[PDB]
Amino acid sequence: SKSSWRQEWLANLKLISVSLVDEFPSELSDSDRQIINEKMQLLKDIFANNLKSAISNNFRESDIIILKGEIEDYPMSSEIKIYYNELQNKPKARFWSFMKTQRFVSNMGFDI
């Protein structure tokens, strides 16, 4: 069943657009910033070369949005959270933190 769930996800990822945000939700050290940035880049490579997804430069034009934290950690002033808030107050994009994403990609058979 997880095997079937992976094959369904794998086939669907070939027809998905992924966006990786540049905004950090909160204050971190230069070390924590660097570690996240490295993972973001590794994740971008997994989606484009292994999962075969399209990489979108506009998060408003993508199916899955990779964040530098949880959406609840993002400030009200941030464009990514302003966009998120609209999709709640209107009846379809996905918002995954890098940690959530890293685990999903592990579940796809790819470990950073």
Partner: peptide, 9 residues
């Protein structure tokens, strides 16, 4: 196209 991101429990 909108199946769960989390594996089945």
């Amino acid at each position: 196209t909108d199946l769960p991101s989390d594996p089945p429990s």
